[PDB]
Amino acid sequence: LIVTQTMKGLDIQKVAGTWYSLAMAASDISLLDAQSAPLRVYVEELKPTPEGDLEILLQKWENDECAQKKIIAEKTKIPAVFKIDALNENKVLVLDTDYKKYLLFCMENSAEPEQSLVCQCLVRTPEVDDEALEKFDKALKALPMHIRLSFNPTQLEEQC
Amino acid sequence: QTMKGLDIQKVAGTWYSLAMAASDISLLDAQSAPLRVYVEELKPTPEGDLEILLQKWENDECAQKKIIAEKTKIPAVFKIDALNENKVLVLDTDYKKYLLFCMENSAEPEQSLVCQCLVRTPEVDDEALEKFDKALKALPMHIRLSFNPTQ
Structure with a gap:
C-alpha cells in the first residue's frame, strides 16, 4: 500500500504490445x-493512446467462457499512475519495467489502501525467465500480501 | 528434508492452519x-500411527474430513490409507507452538505437493512463517496463502 516502488521516467508509449500475467499477488x-x-484477471494487451492514456485488455474467467474486458486507465498529474475507473479498484501503479522484458503493476482502491492492493508481474513472451520474478518478489517485500500465484499452466493458457 | 527425532504422540491436539502452499x-x-483443507486436530495412536481431522468445503458446508496415516520405516513419514499413493512428511515442529508438514502423492503424472505451517493457537507468528518459507525454498511451489486466522 506504500513503499516508493513508483516508476520514474516512464514512457507509456514503449509498453505497447501484448503481455502475459506471469504472477499475481493480493493483500x-x-x-x-x-x-x-x-x-x-489476465492482462492480454497494453495499448497506449496519443493523449497519454492506457488501454488495457484483460481476460476474465466468466461462466465457463473467457469474457474480454477493456479498461481505460487515465493518466494523472503523476506519471506512472493512472485512474481505472472500475467500481472495485480506482488506481493503477506502474512500479517498474524495462519496456523490453517485464512489467510490474498494482491496482488499488485509494479509499481502502489496506486491502484492495493487487500486483502483477507481466512478461512480453509466453516463455519464461527468473528475472521477472526476482524483481517482482523484491517489490512485494514491504507489502501486506496474503496470497501469491505463479503461473506455468503456461501463458498459452490452461485457464483461458 | 524430514525432521529427525519426531515424537508423534507429542503433536497431539488442536492446531490451526496458518499458511499453505502447493506446487x-x-x-x-x-x-x-x-x-x-484446514487442519482441525492431530490424533496420534498408541501404536504410533496418525489420525488427522480436517475442515473442508463440500456442498457449501465446511464438512469434517478424517485421514488415517500409518507409520513407515522412517520417523516423520506417514503412509496415508488411500487409493492414491499418499505420504505425509513432518519437516519440523517445536511441539509447543508450530508444526510444518507436506502432503505428497506419487500417483500424479508429475508431482502434486502441499505443505502447511500449523500453530497451536489462533495467533499469527513470525517464527512459524519464517521457518515455513525457508523450508519451501527447495520445493517447486506455485501458490502461497497466509491467514489472519479463520477458515
Missing part, C-alpha cells in the same frame, strides 16, 4: 481466491 | 479446491 485472498474471484 | 494452483484453487 486479501478473497480477491484472487478463485478464477471467479474479482481481481483474478 | 499446483489447482490444488488450492478456490476455497473448494481439493487440498484446500
Whole structure:
C-alpha cells in the first residue's frame, strides 16, 4: 500500500504490445481466491493512446467462457499512475519495467489502501525467465500480501 | 528434508492452519479446491500411527474430513490409507507452538505437493512463517496463502 516502488521516467508509449500475467499477488485472498474471484484477471494487451492514456485488455474467467474486458486507465498529474475507473479498484501503479522484458503493476482502491492492493508481474513472451520474478518478489517485500500465484499452466493458457 | 527425532504422540491436539502452499494452483484453487483443507486436530495412536481431522468445503458446508496415516520405516513419514499413493512428511515442529508438514502423492503424472505451517493457537507468528518459507525454498511451489486466522 506504500513503499516508493513508483516508476520514474516512464514512457507509456514503449509498453505497447501484448503481455502475459506471469504472477499475481493480493493483500486479501478473497480477491484472487478463485478464477471467479474479482481481481483474478489476465492482462492480454497494453495499448497506449496519443493523449497519454492506457488501454488495457484483460481476460476474465466468466461462466465457463473467457469474457474480454477493456479498461481505460487515465493518466494523472503523476506519471506512472493512472485512474481505472472500475467500481472495485480506482488506481493503477506502474512500479517498474524495462519496456523490453517485464512489467510490474498494482491496482488499488485509494479509499481502502489496506486491502484492495493487487500486483502483477507481466512478461512480453509466453516463455519464461527468473528475472521477472526476482524483481517482482523484491517489490512485494514491504507489502501486506496474503496470497501469491505463479503461473506455468503456461501463458498459452490452461485457464483461458 | 524430514525432521529427525519426531515424537508423534507429542503433536497431539488442536492446531490451526496458518499458511499453505502447493506446487499446483489447482490444488488450492478456490476455497473448494481439493487440498484446500484446514487442519482441525492431530490424533496420534498408541501404536504410533496418525489420525488427522480436517475442515473442508463440500456442498457449501465446511464438512469434517478424517485421514488415517500409518507409520513407515522412517520417523516423520506417514503412509496415508488411500487409493492414491499418499505420504505425509513432518519437516519440523517445536511441539509447543508450530508444526510444518507436506502432503505428497506419487500417483500424479508429475508431482502434486502441499505443505502447511500449523500453530497451536489462533495467533499469527513470525517464527512459524519464517521457518515455513525457508523450508519451501527447495520445493517447486506455485501458490502461497497466509491467514489472519479463520477458515
